[PDB]
């Protein structure tokens, strides 16, 4: 084992472990370890087991054409398929003498085949330089890509596959497919050939998984004989035609969907969603499918997903006069079950024609004894049925509630494209058995098709209810279409043909009907008898419920229609689907809640210790900022509240007497006893007057009661002016609801939290005449003090809607903002007095703004104070510019007339750099024109410093004539406007900004130009935003009022009105009309 020490030195499995094995070195007489023949087989189960290596074996010019030619055989097989074989892997030096022959002759015949297969079973050994070329021949592309992890120890360089462009002629087409073949005899060199292809996904692998070992194994021969080394230094027989079968199927996979698209959209039955269907039919990938079994699985999943109807029929796995009336009475058996109940059993539906021609015997035998039955039961458990042609005839006998003809079911056939309405046959020769009293169908899991249709039709129309197990769901309205059968394939597809839209207009996909009583098939008869026994008293329960609801309900206006609706439902028999008491109770609850609009109505079937208790119940603390946090965990007493008196008032109430702000924690209060609530409310209001809190209306007393505050309960009253806050959550009880309503109606608190559902002021459970059923209904109602309307019936609507966990922080923010309100008003008034267009008007605003303290003391929250302050400022000052918030073209017209238009403003410094540009841009085209037209109807706005530039550019050089005096309050002075040392008419509109019209204004004072258009927007100077100490207020203050005008009546607010009013779109057309005439 001296060779092994140097050749194989990979640390991934050695780390020098063989150095200990190297210590054996010669070891020529170590047979004592094991006898000669093995001890290599022992090492096969020894070191090789510890190595965990891919196998280890130790034992005890025409000339090149001739050798290679025997290694391959290429021919065109059926289906236009090429076969390739190889036993010696080529090398770089080989193609220097053999590559031309491979491409001239062998490769030419390969490209003429639609599919190619390569064989690697007989590959044993070869060089490494041959693999980059075989992939290059196979790879359609020309870009070099390297994806490989293999390294050779003597080369000391990692090897990655390279697709060289050295190939001669056209490469393999990307459209055609190839498959690799391998076996146990496949060599390592051929193993990585398939390994790269599988990762490339270009080809597919067939047959048994190969060894997957090292690509090459180093060989060495020393000693006398009997052993040559094969150390790895470099790190199912039927599959020949199996791929051909795959290729043949793959040859038809381009055509596997053409027929499927043809048969699917034949008619409207299955293509109700055809825009999605046809789109997805071409979306299936032919590379993913690799086998016939896999083809079935992928097509089935895709077909169900696109149609969104998985339960419907889908793709299926491929395939490899005496005797006459004697019979009439024999097929149909009728018995008088005790209790005057008719029993009917069916075995087969026969045919509609047979029943039509044998009707008189059939009716004379079955309906003559069945006419006297109070209730009828049908036992079709043992009835496959078969044809469904006679279904409408049987349904005609059961006329239903309405004797008039009515459609039962609508059927549409794909083959005929005919929609037929099945009206109730009213010419039957029978006694017309009525559905009154109920008919019950006993259905097993063997109803098959016709009986199952009859049962489903009975259930849908409501004329019957089903007792028994679920149905099989098998249906005969389905045709299996052939689809691509060849040799052993035999694929098959089944497609539904009938739609069978019911009376409700909902298509019945089929597959099984759920009965109203899931009971074992054997136990169906006793269950049906029990349902008979229960259904005899259905009317009594409904009548009792109606009478009770009339007797003890707070709102009679609801009862006036509730009684009628319940009676109408009972008369028709819509409750026949109830099988047990609980189901009937649930249905009654659903009906009452859905039509009465009330969700509270419900029906269902069957010393030191005092101090410790009160301290455990309450959580009293004074939060920072002088505000209380009294919490009512559970307080729903009647007289013990006034019984305890001082022992609790001194301990709890006397501590929070001087809080100056009180917060009630009603989030956790399941108390639902609105009995002594007004006593608690009387503390907050004024003692001397009798304040009407709310009025309660009692049905039993049948008149409206009034609730008044207690004149005197204790000497510690909270106080009227001091604020209050109430916190309500979704789990709040009934008492807290009443407290919140009575504080919100009188406008005493500010409810913060989330809406709470369920008032239930006072509920009392009453029992109907029958024991098992109890009714829970609100026997009380409260009317508001302000108006006679009842309460919201759904709970309070908090002014601030926040989750119950964050409610306390919101209350803290609210009280902080309320405390901050007066300072905000004071500083806003001071700022307005300081800066404004009119100093006297600003002083008046500041004086008057201080008188709105009372109105601002009840602000709901932030961002409403801002809007209400804006409204107050805008009503105080006629300027609508007081807002508050919270966090170049040139043309020449006809007749020698110039044109100008611009709507954006920039700073004088900004225009200084571009001042030179505009001289040769806007003035070059207008220097020669007789007249000018200027438009600013779409002006956006900007600073007023650019005014002087506009006047200076327009005016000719000379002594300054411009005169404008403007009071600048931030400057605390007045500034005069001076200019920098034909005809023109202004085009204005309402969209002109507040920075535009002053240009128009100064034009009309000097008389140089006239103005055409309509009224301006009444803007102002660009307001200077201001920041208040509160972060939520940005006050905008107009200033720099134009006062230098002799008249003293500013354009502000009112705007500028031109001489003649014209529309903005017509103003431009009207702009040049008079210019032409005045030059005409």
Numbering used by the authors: 32 to 91, 110 to 284, 309 to 393, 417 to 702, 721 to 1001, 1031 to 1124, 1135 to 1233
Quote the authors verbatim.
RBP3 resides mainly in the IPM, and it transports retinoids, fatty acids such as docosahexaenoic acid (DHA), and other hydrophobic molecules like retinoic acid, cholesterol and alpha-tocopherol, between the RPE and the photoreceptors, playing an important role in the visual cycle. Based on molecular characteristics, RBP3 consists of four tandem homologous modules of approximately 300 amino acids each, but elucidation of the three-dimensional structure of the intact multi-modular RBP3 has been largely evasive.
In the current work, we have determined the structure of the RBP3 protein from the porcine (Sus scofa; pRBP3) retina at a higher resolution, using cryoEM. To obtain an intact RBP3 structure, we used pRBP3 in the presence of CHAPSO, without antibodies or fab fragments (when tested they were detrimental to obtaining good-quality particles). The map sharpened with one b factor (−179.4 Å2) was resolved at 3.67 Å resolution (according to the Fourier Shell Correlation (FSC) = 0.143 criterion), with both flexible arms of the structure being smeared. The map displays the four pRBP3 modules, which adopt a ‘pi’ shape fold, similar to the bovine variant, and have good density for the connected alpha helices that bridge the individual modules. The long module-connecting alpha-helices are bent after turn three, with an angle of approximately 39° and overlap with a root mean square deviation (rmsd) of 0.38−1.12 Å. Each module consists of two domains that are bridged by a disordered linker, not visible on our density maps. Domain A is formed by a three-helix bundle followed by a small β strand (using the first 80 residues of the primary sequence) that forms a three-strand anti-parallel β-sheet by the contribution of a two-strand insertion from 20 residues in the middle of domain B. This domain is responsible for binding fatty acids; but on our maps (due to the resolution and/or the ligands being washed out during purification), no density is visible at the binding sites. The pRBP3 primary sequence also harbours seven cysteine residues, five of which could be modelled and do not engage in disulfide bonds.
